[PDB]
Amino acid sequence: MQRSPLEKASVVSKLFFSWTRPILRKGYRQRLELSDIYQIPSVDSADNLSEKLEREWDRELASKKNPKLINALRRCFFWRFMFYGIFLYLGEVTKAVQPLLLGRIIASYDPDNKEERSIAIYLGIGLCLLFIVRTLLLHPAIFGLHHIGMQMRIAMFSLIYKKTLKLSSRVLDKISIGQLVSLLSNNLNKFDEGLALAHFVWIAPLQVALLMGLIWELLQASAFCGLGFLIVLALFQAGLGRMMMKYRDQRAGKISERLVITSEMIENIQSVKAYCWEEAMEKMIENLRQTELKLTRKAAYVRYFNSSAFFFSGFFVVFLSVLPYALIKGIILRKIFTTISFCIVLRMAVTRQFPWAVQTWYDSLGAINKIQDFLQKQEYKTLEYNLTTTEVVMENVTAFWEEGFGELFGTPVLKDINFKIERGQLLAVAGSTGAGKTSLLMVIMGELEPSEGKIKHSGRISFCSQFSWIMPGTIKENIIFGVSYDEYRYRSVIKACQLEEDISKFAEKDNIVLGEGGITLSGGQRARISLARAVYKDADLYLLDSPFGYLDVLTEKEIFESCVCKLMANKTRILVTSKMEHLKKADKILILHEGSSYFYGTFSELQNLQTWNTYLRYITVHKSLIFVLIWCLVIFLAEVAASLVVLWLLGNTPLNNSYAVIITSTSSYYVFYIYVGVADTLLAMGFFRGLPLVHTLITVSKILHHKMLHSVLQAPMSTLNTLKAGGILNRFSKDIAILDDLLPLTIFDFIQLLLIVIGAIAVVAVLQPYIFVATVPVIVAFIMLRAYFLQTSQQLKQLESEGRSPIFTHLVTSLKGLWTLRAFGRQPYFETLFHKALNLHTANWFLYLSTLRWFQMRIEMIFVIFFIAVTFISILTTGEGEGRVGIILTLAMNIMSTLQWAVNSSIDVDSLMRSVSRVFKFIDMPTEGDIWPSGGQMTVKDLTAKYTEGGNAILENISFSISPGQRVGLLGRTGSGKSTLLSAFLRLLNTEGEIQIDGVSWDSITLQQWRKAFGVIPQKVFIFSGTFRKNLDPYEQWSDQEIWKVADEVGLRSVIEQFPGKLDFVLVDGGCVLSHGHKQLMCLARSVLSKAKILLLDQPSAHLDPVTYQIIRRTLKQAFADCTVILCEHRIEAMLECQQFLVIEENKVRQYDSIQKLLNERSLFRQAISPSDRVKLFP
Ligand SMILES: Nc1ncnc2c1ncn2[C@@H]1O[C@H](COP(=O)(O)OP(=O)(O)OP(=O)(O)O)[C@@H](O)[C@H]1O
Ligand SMILES: Nc1ncnc2c1ncn2[C@@H]1O[C@H](COP(=O)(O)OP(=O)(O)OP(=O)(O)O)[C@@H](O)[C@H]1O
Ligand SMILES: CC(C)(C)c1cc(C(C)(C)C)c(NC(=O)c2c[nH]c3ccccc3c2=O)cc1O
Ligand SMILES: [Mg+2]
Ligand SMILES: [Mg+2]
């Protein structure tokens, strides 16, 4: 890493921004090298800005009765804020005094021998000094203010991430990810750039006050009659401002709901593709955009009138000001041109600078109120007593989940429970699905607080969750989990948990970079890593929430006898399990039932008891847009044509006539200057040109999102395992919101300003030729410097834009794995790990931000340099009477003012046009591409399975044949390939060979038509946010009576009746309200509804007990009558049902007819079988 060149730099270098110069020269010739990206300055790091504001916020919490976050921000930013404000004031004041100096220099070309001709040179000197001071006075203050705004945002972002880790288990149900992601995605670039515009609240009034006097000098009565029109217009904009904000709050609720649906479906797309929910998910996301875009359009139409106010005002402010003075006294052109020059600044001050400044203050404080509201919430309390006899004691405990019934005190999940545990013995927590076994562990950890009862143990605890969580990184980084490495400990664990088999198969042996969640691995592999993490941790208590769910019996025995009873000796360790073998070796047993202790004692006792392309493609999405743009241009040509013949008549005039005083001399060089002043209004886009342009540009973003969401869903699996969670969630949140909100109007201003320049030059050029020639040398200078700047700016903007993903990627996983982070207590790791992601983004954003102010300053300096040259050539060459050089040049330089604004607008479009470029990359992804399934017989021949293209072959030369209406068992060691074989049928991963069904092959039919033959039950369960009926059939093909007629057989009768809205209860946080057992029965019903003749079952009974399993076989015997079944199961009770068996090992298959033969070969796998299951197989 290279250190910041800002650190060591002279006042000149910092003032003129010469320290940014290297990266432009480096970026112009070549592609940007990672080496060239400088380290962030020491001032604005994540640690310091956290440390500073954290201290000031707890001080605010400690002192005041009702604390406010703005008070905390005030005491560490206000002086440096106000320090730049006084410079930004003086830099703005100097724009208001330019008309006085320039106006005289213009008047000094007049043949009539005025005093001006005396002072002209002194004004010539002074006006040059007037420009030089402003250029140096404005830009540093803006960068200074941007730099403060960046520090403010980083400081809060860090306090949100510290706060969110200490947040209560009660609150997590209410606040989804969409709440957090939107809050950060909104403020990310908007807040930083804002603090430039913030000050103009108090700059604009003093500017109006200053300007009004200078006008009052010229026009005594009418100036106030003018101002009145702007006071009327200012209130109209304040009206639109309040109206626009109300549309934004109605929409904000809908965006949060779309992101949680969009996240969930892409997070586990492998299930979405298996069930064939493309039409379902697209229609669901489509319906949420209807409400959103309605409120976007209404917000967009209002903002047009706010934006357009400046351009229309121009003519009317001057007209109402000159007209009264004209009638009573009579006016000179000089007097008209001087008022025009004051009015341009006065409008800019009151019409664009004033309403933008206020709108920023609403957004900032609005944002700070949400953060302050988020910071003062219910926190997870800690009450650990390290003093103990290492005796984990529980007595007379009851607990309710929701606040209502618990506070009022529905049945509690635990009641009248008690147990004592000595150190050096394991507890067997047994019961049926929904007994409260997880709920019991949640009370011990203290995530679920008890209403009545008392807990006490030592603070040190270890936890193994039922849903296995893999943070992004290496298997080592997962197993050690943010502590020092130990060769003797690490190796003894992996051998005890026996991952040595699975780790050795991978190319990079130990350390492979696992994605968000670890979908690279299988169900059994994740569980053993989750276990290894819990084992490697040292603590007084080890909680294990059924880690033998996805493991085969041979592995389940070996790991239980090699880890739990060997490596974990002389420790209290409460275990969730439902097998006789585990309860036999166990010391004390606890059998829960309907949240009540059915039995408590010992096992002995229990038995005794009972670039051009990107711009072009965007325009040619929607055909309306190209018609509207042509329709604007033909009307533009008409108004350019209209002004031409007006000025042709006006200039050709042959002129008691007190209305307007003109003479041959004055006429020539004021009539044209007046036109350039009022050109902004004459060429302005009226509601007819404005509204449809805005309307279509929103309709484009609607079409672009549909294609993008459509293309992502039907892309191949390999491409979707490449990209991250935060990478998907970045675009759909931030880069779709840019095409809806910012881009539609940033274009309008760019077009509006571009037309005004062209049309003004055109009319002036056609009428007087030399001005066109005079502009060219200034025109080329801006286009030259623009083409030079963008070569660096474009490349920086992509690094910064793709530099966001790390912040989101981390925020997703952190939240999902929150319960283990607090179990182990690893917040200090994750905070410092999160600080990096902000620093990375700061390093790219700060660099892009600083490079801009260079271009902003240089473009102004180019103008100043040319103006200084123009003015001296004007004044010095001035003849004795009618000097016809300075006239022509200054008129050009009066246009280049409008162009300088258009070039700055042209950069603001290009930066937002990076968003649409990154959207098209997601649209341009590759694509995976009599009654038919009669009997359902399959024929596999020379099949090969691999995930990556040209990688390791998981299965090789596979070939077997199933007969019609036959049940087939599938089995093998954890990580054999059992899932890969089931995925090979649906052909999700890329394969070679052919699987032919009922004498018809793959290549004879389409994929989406092929996949509607199979009814799947995947290994990982997918429950999106919605109602039960929606989760049971998204297409809504079946009736309520039909769903109820299925619900009884799978036995969700009692499960649903618990909740208030029967089949209308909206599930949240990926269906966290249901227990692990009910999620398996949810997938079962979903398959029972979808009446298929072939169906695949990737381990139906994962964590189901022998009682609940009776439902699986009951529904498998009755409902699935004549259809062919491929049953991939670990429990041995399931093997009684199916006839043929497939065994996978050594990347190959073995088919068998009888169970007795299969078990006869493998002695170890036969000895593994439970005594209670052994009597069933062998009579
Ligand atoms: N966050 C929650 N909010 C509301 N109810 C919940 C929540 N978590 C669990 N429950 C409910 O509490 C009961 C017990 O759930 P718990 O997960 O403790 O059961 P379990 O015995 O661990 O089940 P399994 O055998 O499936 O693992 C169930 O009825 C479940 O729906
Ligand atoms: N998405 C993937 N990308 C790369 N390799 C993968 C992927 N999924 C699985 N594998 C590899 O294939 C092996 C077999 O995984 P698979 O899920 O088919 O096994 P399984 O027998 O179904 O496991 P389980 O006992 O957990 O059900 C894994 O151990 C891993 O090495
Ligand atoms: C009839 C005709 C000539 C097509 C026409 C009419 C108007 C109205 C009626 C809106 C003044 C306008 N005016 C506008 O479109 C205006 C657009 N934005 C504004 C913002 C603030 C204040 C006024 C306007 C405005 O008049 C323009 C026209 O070209
Ligand atoms: Mg459970
Ligand atoms: Mg599997």
Curated annotation (Swiss-Prot):
Q: What is the effect of changing I148T?
A: In CF; uncertain significance; loss of bicarbonate transport; decreased inhibition of epithelial sodium channel (ENaC), when tested in a heterologous system; no effect on protein maturation, subcellular location at the plasma membrane, nor on chloride channel activity
Q: Which sequence positions carry the modification called Phosphoserine?
A: S522, S1172
Impact when changing M893R? Abolishes channel activity. Impairs protein maturation, suggesting the protein is retained in the endoplasmic reticulum
Impact of altering S983P? In CF; loss of bicarbonate transport; no effect on protein maturation, subcellular location at the plasma membrane, nor on chloride channel activity
> What mutagenesis or variant effect is reported for D110H?
In CF and CBAVD
Q: Outcome of Y788C?
A: In CBAVD; uncertain significance
Q: What is the effect of changing A534E?
A: In CF; impairs maturation and trafficking to the cell membrane; decrease in channel activity
UniProt EC number: 5.6.1.6
Q: Where does ATP 1 bind?
A: W401, G431, S432, T433, G434, A435, G436, K437, T438, Q466
What tissues is it present in? Expressed in the respiratory airway, including bronchial epithelium, and in the female reproductive tract, including oviduct (at protein level). Detected in pancreatic intercalated ducts in the exocrine tissue, on epithelial cells in intralobular striated ducts in sublingual salivary glands, on apical membranes of crypt cells throughout the small and large intestine, and on the reabsorptive duct in eccrine sweat glands. Detected on the equatorial segment of the sperm head (at protein level). Detected in nasal and bronchial superficial epithelium.
ABC transporter domain spans which residues?
410-610, 938-1171
User: What outcome follows a substitution of D998N?
Assistant: In CF and CBAVD
* Effect on the protein of changing D545N: In CF; impaired maturation of glycan chains
Q: What is the effect of changing G549A?
A: In CBAVD; uncertain significance
* Cytoplasmic side stretches: 1-77, 147-195, 244-298, 696-746, 791-851, 908-1179
Please report which protein family the annotation says this sequence is part of. Answer: Belongs to the ABC transporter superfamily. ABCC family. CFTR transporter (TC 3.A.1.202) subfamily.
Please identify the protein, giving its name as recorded.
Cystic fibrosis transmembrane conductance regulator
Native organism: Homo sapiens (Human)
Starting at the broadest rank, the lineage of the source organism is: Eukaryota, Metazoa, Chordata, Craniata, Vertebrata
